[model samples]
Target: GPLGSIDKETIDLLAFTSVAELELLGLEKLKCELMALGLKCGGTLQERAARLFSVRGLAKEQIDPALFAKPLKGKKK
Candidate 1:
């Protein structure tokens, strides 16, 4: 829905979570992955990667949807 595109199916693949795979994912695409997973897609690249890793191997309904309510620090400058 945002400016990211790592698909749900791609996320399911074990290789997708590997060390090399995570580095190759880039920043914006990682945010996209978080968006699809209904998680807060903020923070640095490493931070975002941590978010994805938290839900690794988890089912869709396993996570709490309310935890993803856009917790960015500021809306506009």
Candidate 2:
């Protein structure tokens, strides 16, 4: 049985959907969890995030705004 109910796939999807937010929470929560309990192999956050997007049929444009940002929306240099 899994220690926590939260699955890797779910966490990955959440991370991909919200990169900045995910990193923040990871520094605060995940790192501590690892220090206290430890983690599994072949479940890297980056890999999972990629898998989530792939499984969900989400393209880079949909997730990364910079890649698909409109010229009009660009801020002044």
Candidate 3:
């Protein structure tokens, strides 16, 4: 049966955010790490950097609300 019991610890480990956080850490950093990865055509610097800044936080603001947006949205269900 496809309904076999799943180990709760395994589920917990898989569902844990540590790995996801690490992955996101890489992706978020990529935006900053990459100097020329932004839009090339017609954006002022702000528009291009906006996507990166949203997740990485501004130097002036220590926290970024958008960081948890993907996980947070799933909680509604």
Candidate 4:
């Protein structure tokens, strides 16, 4: 399934996925997921998975918005 689908469902899946599985996955798979989660997707593939893995079971308030948030845009009129 694509990230274009339900945001929460995608996030929940990412958050619940096993770290072992994350560590084994390819960078393309990890990066795409990170993009969907609005996370930083740089560094080695291991790091990519680690970044996602670390967020498991965390509250939305725990994540650094700067690290994973969509960049701010112009104000709505």
The model with the greater TM-score, 1 or 2, is 1
Reference-based lDDT, each prediction? 0.61, 0.38, 0.35, 0.60
Query: Across residues 1-77, which tens digit of lDDT does each residue of candidate 2 receive?
Result: 13476334443344334433545555444343322221221357664344343424343334543332222333311
RMSD of 2: 15.8
Q: For residues 1-77, write the lDDT of model 4, one tens digit per residue.
A: 22376345444453364666755654577777676566545677677767677777655555665565543353111
**Candidate 2 at residue 70, lDDT?**
26
The reply for model 3, stretches above 4 Å from the true place, is 1-38, 57-77
> For model 2, what is the alpha-carbon lDDT of residue 25?
51
Clashes of each: 0, 0, 0, 0
Candidate 1 wrongly placed segments (more than 4 Å): 1-16, 70-77
lDDT of 3 at 60: 24
Candidate 3's error at 65, in angstroms? 22
Arranged by lDDT with the best first, the candidates are 1, 4, 2, 3
Worst 10 residues of 1 by lDDT: 68-77
The better candidate by TM-score, 1 or 4, is 1
1-77 in candidate 3: lDDT tens per residue?
A: 12367323332233322323443545444434223232222344444345444433223233334332232235412
Please give the range of 10 consecutive residues that has the lowest summed lDDT in model 4: 68-77
